[PDB]
Write a protein that binds this ligand. Sequence first.
Ligand SMILES: O=S(=O)(O)OC[C@H]1O[C@@](COS(=O)(=O)O)(O[C@H]2O[C@H](COS(=O)(=O)O)[C@@H](OS(=O)(=O)O)[C@H](OS(=O)(=O)O)[C@H]2OS(=O)(=O)O)[C@@H](OS(=O)(=O)O)[C@@H]1OS(=O)(=O)O
Ligand SMILES: O=S(=O)(O)OC[C@H]1O[C@@](COS(=O)(=O)O)(O[C@H]2O[C@H](COS(=O)(=O)O)[C@@H](OS(=O)(=O)O)[C@H](OS(=O)(=O)O)[C@H]2OS(=O)(=O)O)[C@@H](OS(=O)(=O)O)[C@@H]1OS(=O)(=O)O
Ligand SMILES: [Mg+2]
Ligand SMILES: [Mg+2]
Lengths: 103, 517
Amino acid sequence: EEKFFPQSGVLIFGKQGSEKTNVDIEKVMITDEEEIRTTNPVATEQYGSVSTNLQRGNRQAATADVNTQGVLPGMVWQDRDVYLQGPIWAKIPHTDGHFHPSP
Amino acid sequence: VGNSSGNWHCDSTWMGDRVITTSTRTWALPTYNNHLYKQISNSTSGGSSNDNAYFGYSTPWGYFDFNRFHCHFSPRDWQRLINNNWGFRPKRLSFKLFNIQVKEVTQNEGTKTIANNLTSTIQVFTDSEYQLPYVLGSAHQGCLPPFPADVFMIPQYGYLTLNNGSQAVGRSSFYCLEYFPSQMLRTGNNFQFTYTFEDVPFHSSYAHSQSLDRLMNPLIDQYLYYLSRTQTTGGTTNTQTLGFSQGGPNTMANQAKNWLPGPCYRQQRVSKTSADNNNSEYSWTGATKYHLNGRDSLVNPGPAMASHKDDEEKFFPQSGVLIFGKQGSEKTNVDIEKVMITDEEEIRTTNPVATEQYGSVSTNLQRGNRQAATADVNTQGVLPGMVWQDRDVYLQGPIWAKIPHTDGHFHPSPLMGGFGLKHPPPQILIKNTPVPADPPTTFNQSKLNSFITQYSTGQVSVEIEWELQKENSKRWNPEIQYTSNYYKSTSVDFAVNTEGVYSEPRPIGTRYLTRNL
Ligand SMILES: O=S(=O)(O)OC[C@H]1O[C@@](COS(=O)(=O)O)(O[C@H]2O[C@H](COS(=O)(=O)O)[C@@H](OS(=O)(=O)O)[C@H](OS(=O)(=O)O)[C@H]2OS(=O)(=O)O)[C@@H](OS(=O)(=O)O)[C@@H]1OS(=O)(=O)O
Ligand SMILES: O=S(=O)(O)OC[C@H]1O[C@@](COS(=O)(=O)O)(O[C@H]2O[C@H](COS(=O)(=O)O)[C@@H](OS(=O)(=O)O)[C@H](OS(=O)(=O)O)[C@H]2OS(=O)(=O)O)[C@@H](OS(=O)(=O)O)[C@@H]1OS(=O)(=O)O
Ligand SMILES: [Mg+2]
Ligand SMILES: [Mg+2]
């Protein structure tokens, strides 16, 4: 699925000589993430499917779809890549509640 | 008898990075259930279903309720701490109870007389191993008098175990503290012990200067682009094109950010005015609640959230924040006139608004034939890239809590705000020595029930050492501070009405000092 990519999911880098607006795909270099398809799901894709209520001998068994999700124990992933044509490090917000402050 | 136990030591001190304070007060200790245990389950409930099920007992003993601030600190000092330091935590603690006085009481023909019975004694201890159900942290009332001169009584003690509504599973334990060591103490005999905390992140007592959405410079743009043109507004043939833009000093909303708002949970937006609320009883129905073993229940005093957005003073989460009735509030249906609802117009920088939606996500997969769907997202979970700040302090509230000794826990920061500990300060329990009344002259197989109604008093000492972080910021402009309104009022704030009974005009938070995010 090279054609499709997250609308705002990844990064965009215009080749040398790009104006400020409405430039075309001809100029930028969109970041393909066909690499993490091992651990991390696809944002453009659904995530899972869960039970809707409680099937029974009279009422049919429902199966709800799950697009958005949260985190739970038993989950492992890998943050975004590097892209030297991009940022190198970031700044963590000095607050109290933070989690896996990976950029 | 011919000697007192300990002076009255109750003041505050600011040695700088530390601040020691203690509160000396007096109490009273009445007998209970006539020194008898009880089995309190939904058999004494009288109404509730598997929703308010409870199976526990009632111990004749009592415990201490000093888990608050307005009862440990004075108003001014609180102000002192708040307006000066960014963060703080508790370091050391001590406890002393003495000058005990037992007074038996006879009741001859409605004509009762209170004499003194020094011959008696008392027994009290502390649960270090945390083998007893931690009760505090539930923020039950009957706390130390948020005032010094007034004395009070120690609340009885009762706990609960696993239960199947009106009954209990075998896995429903049973406890009896009288199976523990207790510093048997007679009058004239003093009592003291010592405790120390462990490391805990200082409650971030500060307000942020910027916001997640606005932490980026304006004068510049982002060499990074984004999809700002799905179609081509080149006329009436708005085909499917791909225009892109960068960090517009105006399009900063569409700009690029690296962090994300903390987790959330959708609440029901109510209002302080009446006519703004619909006309239906959703207090227990249209409310935000969870489910557990059928025992469905609320999901607050809180969540990890901020009350509302800008200029929405009228609306507040239904059950999102705390509620504190001014001095002199009954048990039910009192009106908004009495309580002091907690406004959270402070965290609108990091944490979203529970009464508000959270986000909006793609529903399926747009295409040239089928339209692009956009689903709404009220509830959420947590993910990397999320940062927030737990609830505030509210000295008219809890001070710390108790972490459940389990395996799986996460950011055990309390939902009632405050501090959590894997090994919290113990629970103090006391009882009056069972004085068996006149026993039968001849033998009897049964046990003794007859006693002498008696109680005692004494002084509660509690040294709380404190750590702090003061504002070192170069905020050129005068940040905001908290101060009693400088005008003239009839009854001064936190003052004693002409009847000695004093109250608190308003609740107080910490996030005051403008700390750069
Ligand atoms: O307790 S639960 O609501 O969770 O559900 C299990 C039992 O509830 C029923 C009936 O309710 S009861 O008053 O608690 O006994 O719920 C299911 O049916 C009720 C009304 O149905 S019924 O024809 O009288 O049995 C509906 O709603 S409600 O009770 O929640 O107000 C529910 O269905 S619907 O999708 O709105 O049509 C349904 O419950 S649920 O929404 O799935 O939770 C009985 O359900 S049943 O198993 O499907 O028949 C259960 O009791 S039972 O008599 O043993 O069946
Ligand atoms: O594989 S997916 O289901 O995820 O979707 C992409 C392709 O599936 C279609 C058709 O299905 S196929 O049998 O796998 O080739 O799904 C979309 O349409 C199907 C039935 O449509 S169609 O007219 O025969 O093309 C619907 O359902 S289902 O296949 O899941 O049972 C879906 O639509 S609906 O909302 O229920 O009406 C729809 O898929 S989805 O629910 O969005 O996942 C084709 O979809 S399309 O791109 O919208 O046309 C895709 O294949 S395609 O032939 O290349 O288009
Ligand atoms: Mg239901
Ligand atoms: Mg589908």
